[PDB]
DNA sequence: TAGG
């Protein structure tokens, strides 16, 4: 059963700073979902630029799509090739409404607590 | 020497002498330790204080049952809330203050919600150990500022119980997030009026008591709740039952109307997974439905609980000494010498105040 | 360290929901092999919550491997008037029937399954948390619930 | 005089 993946800053993932390959959890707004290989195109922007990660589901076959919604994928984000970042959707959940920048703020607070030993 | 029948008083104005009148340290006012001493070395105490409620009652006779000699004048007892006040007790404590009415039509300003100082009033400790005050031959009371006009209320704080080893020196009334783990004791008790004797179907058996005809629906539910740091024992009667279950007016109505017939159904609980500990009917349908809920997070809800210590700081005879623990974490039970449970009366049930974006598909009926 | 006889400790009586990565790093006490130590603070039946990567229909338990982006840890999730009871299950049978691909919470006992810090569910439920709606307050209190007492010394 |  798979490995863990934290929340790196959602605009450093698809650029190539965080070590790819290992497990990761990331979100992204569904724009043109791919149904055959189950490829979501998660977007990435926080007032900086438009990075993009991809999602290819492996385990669950019955998983549909939704228009205009962020998606959380936890799984294998391998070192994907030119202009791509595929996170194998062994965990696939929906995101809507929830204040997400505040979520990353709490994640950074968690990374801060990591130090208090 | 008494004042004479034709003399005159004069205020030697405070602006006239100033040697010692500058040191007019507060007119008699006993302090924290005094009122927190079962044997306050004198007979009369004195204190600043502010009231929250006033209530009257008859001057009942000792043990409620005495002879048929005469009807002594209705020296009607009065009990008053007091938010105890001095320098210390940094958080708001409380007490009840008693006053008799033998020759004592209460003075003015005696309202729920003013500022007043008292003195030379008897502090003692009851047979039930409660601390109290009473009048004497030197009674003293004086308002400090009129009861207010802005009647804005004040709710209870939002904290976590990782700070509350003791029973006082704290926001006695408080609130905190938690998750329910068990019930304690439920009694649906349809009973009489003057004595509250069991009424099956809404009709008693002891009924020799009184001409009342419709029973009274004493609905008691008591819960066990974890809160992230310690245990939480909670009790409620007649108010927090259908809500702790979760039944709307019609729903709890139909509940009591099924349970009407026996009029008295009881369960006891003491922890998670613990089955019926009272002596309810294993065959009645409501028993099985109730316990089917008692094995559900519907009766164990992760919610926000409002609580204040149950044994008032009047005189807290400690419940029980430390005890033992033989329970497993890992693969082994392990022992220490730790303390037993607590008494935090529920005050307002705050339901699952968790986030509302678990789904924007909430409901339509 | 802290002997078992050195535990008036509050969470020694109550549950806890702690840092899964440091729960891994929680010292498995050598006094009793299997109680976790968050700098020396013992629990009885810890609490976790997170996305589930593993699900196996075993003899008495689902196999729910929860990661909350903090770290992985696995859960042996022990497989869980009366007329209107017709509808009764119809509101808790849902939250007690989970599939794979979403988020789940577990609480209960601690055990050691051959190098895995194996949780053993005494209580749990299906959750609509896969959106991580609670998550803001949840992992705002999580660093708080750590920094408060357990990670700190006992008093 | 004064809790269940
Ligand atoms: Zn009766």
Numbering used by the authors:
A (entry chain G): 3 to 119
B (entry chain E): 852 to 1058, 1060 to 1217
C (entry chain F): 11 to 17, 19 to 91, 109 to 183
Paper text:
The CST–Polα/primase complex is essential for telomere maintenance and functions to counteract resection at double-strand breaks. We report a 4.6-Å resolution cryo-EM structure of human CST–Polα/primase, captured prior to catalysis in a recruitment state stabilized by chemical cross-linking. Our structure reveals an evolutionarily conserved interaction between the C-terminal domain of the catalytic POLA1 subunit and an N-terminal expansion in metazoan CTC1.
After initial rigid-body docking followed by flexible fitting and refinement, the overall conformations of the two subcomplexes did not show major changes from their structures in isolation. The primary interaction interface observed in our structure occurs between the C-terminal domain of POLA1 (POLA1CTD, 1,265–1,462 aa) and the N-terminal OB folds of CTC1. The resolution is limiting for rigorous analysis of amino acid interactions, and analysis of surface electrostatic potential suggests that this interface is not driven by a dominant hydrophobic or charged interaction, but rather by shape complementarity of the two proteins, burying 1,250 Å2 of solvent-accessible surface area. CTC1OB-D, an elongated OB fold that shares no homology with known OB folds, forms the major interaction with POLA1CTD. V665 resides on a β-strand of CTC1OB-D, so it is plausible that a glycine substitution would destabilize the β-sheet and OB fold, disrupting the primary interaction.
